[PDB]
Design a protein around this ligand. Structure first.
Ligand SMILES: CC(C)S(=O)(=O)NC[C@H](C)c1ccc(-c2ccc([C@@H](C)CNS(=O)(=O)C(C)C)cc2)cc1
Ligand SMILES: N[C@@H](Cn1cc(F)c(=O)[nH]c1=O)C(=O)O
Length: 262
């Protein structure tokens, strides 16, 4: 018999956010955002009931080098705590080896966020100077991109970041944004272009995305390897793309109510 599908996701704006009046509500109704809407669409097109859960450790998913244990949403799938992850979870090789990903539902690349007026236009710019500190989320695909890169500029950036004092790494996107906003132009934040573009249209309208993206990739909906949900979820993502629903939802959560003018 069909069983309610446990969805793991993460509190990351504008993907999943607690409604202001969440206390009046319960279950799935507590949350709103792009991935809440996407989860509803996927569930509708696959014919399942579901429960949204926020990942216990608040992480995306990395494997500990020593214990080989996966954390975050990836871990929740790997160890059978959740049936599906619907979140801004980047499709990566190391993850694909242990979980399944749908075709991507959103495109993104690593990007640079500055406080307005910061004299930085590119990654190369960052790499050639020391006055302005810069960093990434302390866990996830952005950090891994730099750790692994063999590209000269990116290698130079990683070599700087890994031993920077005090630390240039942050625990959450909100922390990186706060650091950019409060550091008077002396900190730049490396983050996914999707988050960057969202923040750029939020008050107090003091940040800017600069330069091209450093890579090009996508977020995918993840299931445990061999799960019966993999196929219908993938077909649903294809259908939603083709029917324009993904574009509509991106506009809804990024731009339709942007706070920094037109
Ligand atoms: C991890 C990488 C291999 S990757 O991210 O999967 N691809 C890399 C390559 C540069 C790239 C990167 C991003 C995209 C891309 C294109 C479209 C989308 C959405 C809007 C639709 N995805 S879809 O599969 O084409 C669709 C028919 C449902 C999402 C991602 C396509 C290709
Ligand atoms: N999507 C990433 C997590 N993640 C999120 C961000 F907002 C970011 O800037 N960098 C990053 O790695 C992942 O799946 O690891």
């Amino acid at each position: 018999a069909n069983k309610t599908v446990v969805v793991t996701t993460i509190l990351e704006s504008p993907y999943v956010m607690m409604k202001k009046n969440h206390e009046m509500l319960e279950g799935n109704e507590r949350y709103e955002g792009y991935c809440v809407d996407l989860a509803a669409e996927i569930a509708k097109h696959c014919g399942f009931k579901y429960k949204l859960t926020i990942v216990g450790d608040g992480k995306y998913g990395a494997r500990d080098a020593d214990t080989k244990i996966w954390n975050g949403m990836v871990g929740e799938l790997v160890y059978g705590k959740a049936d599906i992850a619907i979140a801004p979870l980047t499709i990566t090789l190391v993850r694909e080896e242990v979980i399944d990903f749908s075709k991507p539902f959103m495109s993104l690349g690593i990007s640079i966020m500055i406080k307005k007026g910061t004299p930085i236009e590119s990654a190369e710019d960052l790499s050639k100077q020391t006055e302005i500190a810069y960093g990434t989320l302390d866990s996830g695909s952005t950090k891994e991109f730099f750790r692994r890169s063999k590209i000269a500029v990116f290698d130079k950036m990683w070599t700087y970041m890994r031993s920077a004092e005090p630390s240039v790494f942050v625990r959450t996107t909100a922390e990186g944004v706060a650091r950019v906003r409060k550091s008077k132009g002396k900190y730049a934040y490396l983050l996914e272009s999707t988050m960057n573009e969202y923040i750029e249209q939020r008050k107090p309208c003091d940040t800017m995305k600069v330069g091209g993206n450093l890579d090009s990739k996508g977020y995918g909906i993840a299931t445990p390897k061999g799960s019966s949900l993999g196929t219908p979820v993938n077909l649903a993502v294809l259908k939603l793309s083709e029917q324009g629903v993904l574009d509509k939802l991106k506009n809804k959560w990024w731009y339709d109510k942007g706070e920094c003018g037109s």
